[PDB]
Amino acid sequence: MKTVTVKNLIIGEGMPKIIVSLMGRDINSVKAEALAYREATFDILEWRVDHFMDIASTQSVLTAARVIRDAMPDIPLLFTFRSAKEGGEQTITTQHYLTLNRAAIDSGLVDMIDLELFTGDADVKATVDYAHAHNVYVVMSNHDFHQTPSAEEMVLRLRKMQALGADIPKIAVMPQSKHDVLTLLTATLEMQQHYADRPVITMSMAKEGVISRLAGEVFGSAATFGAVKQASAPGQIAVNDLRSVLMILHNA
Amino acid sequence: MKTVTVKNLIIGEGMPKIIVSLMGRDINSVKAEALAYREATFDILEWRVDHFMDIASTQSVLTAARVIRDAMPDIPLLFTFRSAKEGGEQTITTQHYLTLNRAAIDSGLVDMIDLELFTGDADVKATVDYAHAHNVYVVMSNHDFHQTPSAEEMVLRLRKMQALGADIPKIAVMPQSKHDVLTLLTATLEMQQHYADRPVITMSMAKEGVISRLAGEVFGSAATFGAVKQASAPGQIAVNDLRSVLMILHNA
Ligand SMILES: O=C(O)[C@@]1(O)C[C@@H](O)[C@H](O)[C@@H](O)[C@@H]1O
Numbered sequence A, B: 001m002k003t004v005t006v007k008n009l010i011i012g013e014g015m016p017k018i019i020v021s022l023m024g025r026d027i028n029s030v031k032a033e034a035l036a037y038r039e040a041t042f043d044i045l046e047w048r049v050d051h052f053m054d055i056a057s058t059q060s061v062l063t064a065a066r067v068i069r070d071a072m073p074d075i076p077l078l079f080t081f082r083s084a085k086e087g088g089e090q091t092i093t094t095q096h097y098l099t100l101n102r103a104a105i106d107s108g109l110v111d112m113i114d115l116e117l118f119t120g121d122a123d124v125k126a127t128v129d130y131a132h133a134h135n136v137y138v139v140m141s142n143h144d145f146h147q148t149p150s151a152e153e154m155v156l157r158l159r160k161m162q163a164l165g166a167d168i169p170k171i172a173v174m175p176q177s178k179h180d181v182l183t184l185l186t187a188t189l190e191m192q193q194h195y196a197d198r199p200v201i202t203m204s205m206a207k208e209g210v211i212s213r214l215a216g217e218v219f220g221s222a223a224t225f226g227a228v229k230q231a232s233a234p235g236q237i238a239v240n241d242l243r244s245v246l247m248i249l250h251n252a
């Protein structure tokens, strides 16, 4: 297991790390959220860049990132543009997506970026290499917002992310049944037991999947998302409640 | 689902119900436990008769049952002699097990009795009929303190308990791996979604299995054991922590 240490936080050991998402639509809302989030308790801040409605300007994006960094200098900061293809808020070109991520990487403002596995192998490899050249870690992501793939297909994808150099593979899938939640936990455990080369983040979304956001320590998900106010994906619960449950499971 | 209602407690819907066990050796210790338990919050009181010293005398056992009944007149009361055969604290003959349970049933002092599935069919059938004739519910139980059977085997056992007239089938198994915990959850979910017509209680024991004590509302276990101070089986957690998690899951 190659753990990821970001600003003294060791991802891949101990309790799953709590991630919250900041989703402001404009610079004034981002400023307000950055300030308000300071008093919530969590491990990693994700900026959901696809919720920002001035992504047209690289300057605007980097200024927003700087505002977040200014408010929370000691927090691991994850820059995530979730593509429309994988459930995000707006469609942009592939080159625009890559440019935003490269600018985030070389700005020094963020500790981690999210890169989607199926962006294209050459572009993924180039962007992973660029991140690593500038001491930025890569959360490599895949989503299925319609259904839960087979456990074997989920493992295949997580292993592909490892093969492409991801620091932290990540998969989120949508259960259509309680059985599907067990499939996700099964795939997670299969990584822990047999393909445990780096930390992985997994979740089954929606209400039925909530237990997967709570049981990461048992089956091997290194982080979990909570909501400060609004959820950034279906099934997230209030961040303080999430923390309470994680602590109970950790100490049981 | 047809629920089981005891003293206004509805077992088989809503949040899983919390059972705590009382474990004293004699009348004074049973009184001291019952008094201490006034400060705790739980749904069902189980008397673990196998922890009592003078189990030889039916009179001694009934006197203790009466003390407990009178100490907590409004709580659902479950009478459980766990045989050393199934992880309990001392041995008992099948005939004396029969005598104690029949006496508990016909005394009016208990709302529910635990009856071990593997006691023997004639004795199980007779005792189920005796319980029902006296308006006492049967938690029919099976434990494996060493290992986890296949999901197929566990589901068949729960179905057999239903066929033999259990009001609430119950199985507890010991994981030897994290995979074994998932097997128990899988069996629980199969039972609940395909075969059950009444509440069922399941658990994977030990620290490894703790999630099974928390996730009953999701996968289909109607009750869960917590510890006031001392656990009555491996893996039970503090009863207030148990309740905190159950409420968070219920409201997610
Ligand atoms: O918690 C989730 O399901 C997320 O979709 C939330 C989202 O904001 C993150 O970008 C994603 O990594 C999670 O999988």
Ligand SMILES: O=C(O)[C@@]1(O)C[C@@H](O)[C@H](O)[C@@H](O)[C@@H]1O
Binding pocket: B021, B046, B048, B080, B082, B114, B141, B170, B171, B172, B203, B205, B225, B232, B233, B234, B236
């Ligand atoms: O919580 C458990 O595992 C128990 O063994 C506790 C015990 O006191 C109960 O009689 C039994 O039904 C549980 O399975």
Ligand SMILES: [Cl-]
Binding pocket: A102, A103, A106
């Ligand atoms: Cl560049």
Ligand code: NA
Binding pocket: A079, A080, A081, A082, A101, A113, A114, A115
């Ligand atoms: Na991104």
Ligand code: NA
Binding pocket: A082, A083, A084, A085, A090, A091, A092, A093
């Ligand atoms: Na897009």
Ligand code: NA
Binding pocket: A106
């Ligand atoms: Na550069």
Ligand code: NA
Binding pocket: B023, B024, B025, B033
């Ligand atoms: Na005691």
Ligand code: NA
Binding pocket: B079, B080, B081, B082, B101, B113, B114, B115
């Ligand atoms: Na009994």
Ligand code: NA
Binding pocket: B106
């Ligand atoms: Na009688």
Ligand code: NA
Binding pocket: B108, B110, B111, B134, B135, B136
């Ligand atoms: Na009765």
